[PDB]
Symmetry: D2
Amino acid sequence: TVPVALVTGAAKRLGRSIAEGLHAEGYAVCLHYHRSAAEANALSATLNARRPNSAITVQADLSNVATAPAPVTLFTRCAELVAACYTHWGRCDVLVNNASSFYPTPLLRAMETATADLFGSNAIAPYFLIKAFAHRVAGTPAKHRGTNYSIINMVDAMTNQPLLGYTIYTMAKGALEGLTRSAALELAPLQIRVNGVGPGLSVLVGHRSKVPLYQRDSSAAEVSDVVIFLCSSKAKYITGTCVKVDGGYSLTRA
Amino acid sequence: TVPVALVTGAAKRLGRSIAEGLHAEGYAVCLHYHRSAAEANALSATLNARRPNSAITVQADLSNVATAPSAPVTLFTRCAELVAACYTHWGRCDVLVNNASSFYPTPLLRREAMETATADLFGSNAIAPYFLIKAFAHRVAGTPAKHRGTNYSIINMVDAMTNQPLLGYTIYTMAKGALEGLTRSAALELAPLQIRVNGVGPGLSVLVGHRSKVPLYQRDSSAAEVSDVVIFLCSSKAKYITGTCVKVDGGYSLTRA
Amino acid sequence: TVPVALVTGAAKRLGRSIAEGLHAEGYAVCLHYHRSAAEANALSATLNARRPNSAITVQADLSNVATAPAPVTLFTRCAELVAACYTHWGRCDVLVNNASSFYPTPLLRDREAMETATADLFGSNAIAPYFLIKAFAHRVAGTPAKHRGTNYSIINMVDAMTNQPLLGYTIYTMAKGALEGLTRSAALELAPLQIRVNGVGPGLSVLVDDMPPAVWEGHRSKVPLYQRDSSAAEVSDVVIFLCSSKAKYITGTCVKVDGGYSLTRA
Amino acid sequence: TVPVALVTGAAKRLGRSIAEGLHAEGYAVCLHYHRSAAEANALSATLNARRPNSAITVQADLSNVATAPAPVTLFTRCAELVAACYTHWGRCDVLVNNASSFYPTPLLRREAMETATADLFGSNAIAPYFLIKAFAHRVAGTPAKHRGTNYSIINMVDAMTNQPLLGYTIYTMAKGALEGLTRSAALELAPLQIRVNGVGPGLSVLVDDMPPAVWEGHRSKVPLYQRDSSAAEVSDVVIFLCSSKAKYITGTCVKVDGGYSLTRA
Ligand SMILES: NC(=O)C1=CN([C@@H]2O[C@H](COP(=O)(O)OP(=O)(O)OC[C@H]3O[C@@H](n4cnc5c(N)ncnc54)[C@H](OP(=O)(O)O)[C@@H]3O)[C@@H](O)[C@H]2O)C=CC1
Ligand SMILES: NC(=O)C1=CN([C@@H]2O[C@H](COP(=O)(O)OP(=O)(O)OC[C@H]3O[C@@H](n4cnc5c(N)ncnc54)[C@H](OP(=O)(O)O)[C@@H]3O)[C@@H](O)[C@H]2O)C=CC1
Ligand SMILES: NC(=O)C1=CN([C@@H]2O[C@H](COP(=O)(O)OP(=O)(O)OC[C@H]3O[C@@H](n4cnc5c(N)ncnc54)[C@H](OP(=O)(O)O)[C@@H]3O)[C@@H](O)[C@H]2O)C=CC1
Ligand SMILES: NC(=O)C1=CN([C@@H]2O[C@H](COP(=O)(O)OP(=O)(O)OC[C@H]3O[C@@H](n4cnc5c(N)ncnc54)[C@H](OP(=O)(O)O)[C@@H]3O)[C@@H](O)[C@H]2O)C=CC1
Ligand SMILES: O=C1C[C@H](c2ccc(O)c(O)c2)Oc2ccc(O)cc21
Ligand SMILES: O=C1C[C@H](c2ccc(O)c(O)c2)Oc2ccc(O)cc21
Ligand SMILES: O=C1C[C@H](c2ccc(O)c(O)c2)Oc2ccc(O)cc21
Ligand SMILES: O=C1C[C@H](c2ccc(O)c(O)c2)Oc2ccc(O)cc21
């Protein structure tokens, strides 16, 4: 029988690679997107042409704001993301919190949008998603649960060496790290594993020559393959961990 | 000549110990409070009686919500206003201690309650500290270099034990994680203005069971056992220290179940 | 043509499981052992049965002491372990530093004990891996570039729980700390040769039941995920993954395999 | 009556400043040295002039080798360093493991080999272990009514060893070991109220023997102050962790690095 993965920010780049890698392992994939509707749908078309009934796409803004229909809260929109898996395939085995906004929030020379957007997508939405994922599992009768529940948070290998001017983003990745550890401890009784993967420089649009390994940013596969392994039954003893995929970049000093 | 400290959640417990310790070094202290008006004002009375015009108190809800006034007033404005209060009253703000921290369960395993918890926990512990630091920094940057103080220090109160999370406290644990990130990012970016940014993480302090589990002394800390560390990190002897965290937990993070 | 793995302490438990997992991927394996000669030979028969000439065994004390021949240093014993791979199969692609001694060295209450403990605990957990990495790297550097393999990888078996020290095990915990510094230092310095160096740190894995059963049950019950120790495979599969081409951007890291044990507090 | 501090590598640089700082708080100081006899002796002269019988000097090689006789072990040499405090003043309250060897051991290219491992691992990790063990033994053997009331051990570790200096593998491993000792000793020695902490400099009193451009180069990399630290900028932190105000702190490391560890290449 066929497991289901929910992948946020799945339309392009690492999220796409993650969805493709999970698809190749036999997963049906729910492809979340925000603005990249055409890329999400083209992705879904490729994958459904490969195996019918193996991809859907769902839209949501994961910023921490109310949207239009009572206003719709982020919590609700997160619970509905997970509900789309259960509605279409009756299960949700893997969650990958990949979607992320990333832009400067300088301390030294509006703010309310940056805060909602950078914290929502990077931290608050992952928490609501993990909470909805777990409620669904706890509400499944023990005999009917899957046997390999796995949540991956995409964190950042370099946030201990902060990028100058990216405070809110760096704070939100730090919160997402605390989510990995607290969610791994609390959800262990349900056998839901929760882990982090931290890219260094991946698929850049010249820090890249500073990467000790190969002196380049990584490909998308070089990160997504790690995510796929941590979701595999071979990784069943791994929880509350964080795997850097950074080519040694976090080893460098100015 | 007299430096000024702003201490959030200053009315009781570690915040009061911190404001007392800074006061003892000669600081004037702005005592921020939320609901503890009576406790804050009693503290300010004591300090003012000891040294006239050495304490004020200022009220603010550091939850990430709008509050009642034109338009409603955002967290950002209330945070700027706290820093402004020190500049208004005393012409300076040398030290900021981000101590205010709302703490209660947010279980993942079983909502008006969760919008509230998110705003309150993610606010007091992480978002308000960010806007406070930004307002602190704006001020210094806007002060002519010749008139700047010589010892700017920001202290974030974090948690020695959040790498070993307390079961059921996810949002609070996330918010302390964000606050650790703020310490390292602000330390790097504010270094050109010589503004130092460090963390102090208590383990168990002034508990109101696990106390027996602390390797050193088998008890929680007193308030001064934490606040003395804060005061050291704000002293000129600590001027090469930035971007770092000091645990004050009597070895509790060393323990495994 | 067939890649080669050296696995120290490979006779039993996790080192055996590592050697088997690498053999299953198609590596030829040099199984190092110290006193478990019968177990190493047994395992070597099994692998050589699945696939002829794909396992050998080599004996070495990896304690930081000179042995009987002029006297033989630890360094020389480590260079010879790596040489054995090259002599027999013309290459060494993978090194797994797994061999480890582990016993109490209390700070609080014969100096023979104290002496030999330091040499044995540091040698096997830290100094031999240093020399082994040095020898592995000198060989790769000494290979004409055209003839180099395309996936060199060193795994160092660390401990997920050494930041929460086991009471009474100071020297062991210090040695594991040196071994984490070796991972980071060797990763940085060997990056130009495309040699990845990563850590795997098992928490409670194949716990020997050699005390009252309440103590074995009590230990296991503390692990958040499954309330048990791991199987050997649950660790060795991570080792295998990190040596595979799909891990080729991963270096200088440490993967904990601990069921969330390091998330706990007393 | 007067508390006693044992400082290793006390003769120059940070160890000298730690010794002076502790002395300035009223400590008697046992000044350990290996080659810098003239410096150690001058320091003891200064401290003894300031306060009679407040300093002594003791010489020991802290490399993990046996020395000139039956050979003397690094273990015995460390117990005797502790015993000198007890023989002269009857106590030892503070131990600062400051002595340190630091030089390349490249992975990529005879008695230079074996001597490097012994010297780098000895000074930075194994001698700190035997010193802590001796220090602990002496406290456990003291009747509780005669115990000091503020025992503190400080290990000098390195803020930057997680971003390893290229070519310095043995050194970086030795400091990793010493961080392990901080955490395991703090756990084990907590029942005797002996606190065990680390202080990690980044770039402190950077030595002058390179071209000025290269010296200014290194310094300019530190976010805070674009300079290396003074010796007192590190030693003040050491002294604060030894003070009774720090009595709830154990098993922790304090970085004194001007934010150098927050950088990336
Ligand atoms: N690539 C790199 O070098 C690094 C990546 N990372 C982390 O790895 C993960 C993936 O990286 P990468 O593939 O580069 O990610 P991208 O920066 O390409 O962003 C991923 C997706 O996030 C979605 N997203 C952004 N904001 C929101 C929002 N408010 N609501 C909903 N979705 C949103 C976007 O979806 P849409 O396009 O549909 O609008 C976007 O495609 C991220 O979590 C990132 O933080 C960390 C360090 C370095
Ligand atoms: N005590 C301990 O053992 C531990 C403490 N810590 C940290 O140390 C610091 C001090 O601890 P402790 O003294 O026990 O702190 P408290 O738990 O007593 O909290 C301090 C003050 O924070 C203020 N506060 C709470 N919510 C808000 C809000 N929404 N807006 C404004 N202010 C608010 C309250 O002010 P008022 O009373 O005026 O409403 C409260 O008095 C905190 O940052 C805490 O997280 C970390 C781990 C353990
Ligand atoms: N199992 C666990 O719970 C944990 C394991 N680890 C680490 O994982 C690795 C594997 O664990 P595990 O399988 O339990 O290991 P073991 O304790 O079973 O020991 C591994 C092997 O190391 C070899 N060894 C010991 N001392 C020496 C020496 N002086 N010279 C050469 N070889 C030596 C022994 O070989 P021989 O039998 O041939 O003498 C032994 O079989 C080790 O590095 C360990 O420290 C870390 C934390 C927990
Ligand atoms: N300065 C810096 O920027 C940094 C310093 N540190 C750490 O801080 C501490 C103090 O630093 P610093 O003042 O620079 O230290 P030094 O490099 O100046 O060394 C201090 C003393 O160690 C002694 N020593 C060296 N080898 C041996 C040995 N085999 N046995 C006995 N003693 C020995 C020497 O004593 P003698 O002269 O008497 O021979 C030397 O003066 C050290 O632990 C260092 O590792 C860490 C990172 C950066
Ligand atoms: O593509 C990037 C590079 C960008 C980056 C660029 C340069 C760096 O040195 C560095 O650490 C990170 O990091 C990201 C963080 C979030 C995200 O969604 C995308 C990226
Ligand atoms: O008083 C406490 C104890 C409480 C606590 C209690 C028990 C623990 O094991 C632990 O880690 C933490 O932590 C706090 C966190 C924030 C705060 O504002 C107050 C406290
Ligand atoms: O087999 C074990 C379990 C043992 C162990 C692991 C975790 C514990 O809490 C504990 O009490 C004991 O740790 C080891 C360390 C090194 C080693 O080579 C083997 C082991
Ligand atoms: O003097 C130094 C500076 C030196 C140093 C520190 C930071 C650097 O970037 C660098 O290149 C060199 O580190 C040391 C380590 C041990 C020691 O005993 C002394 C020193």
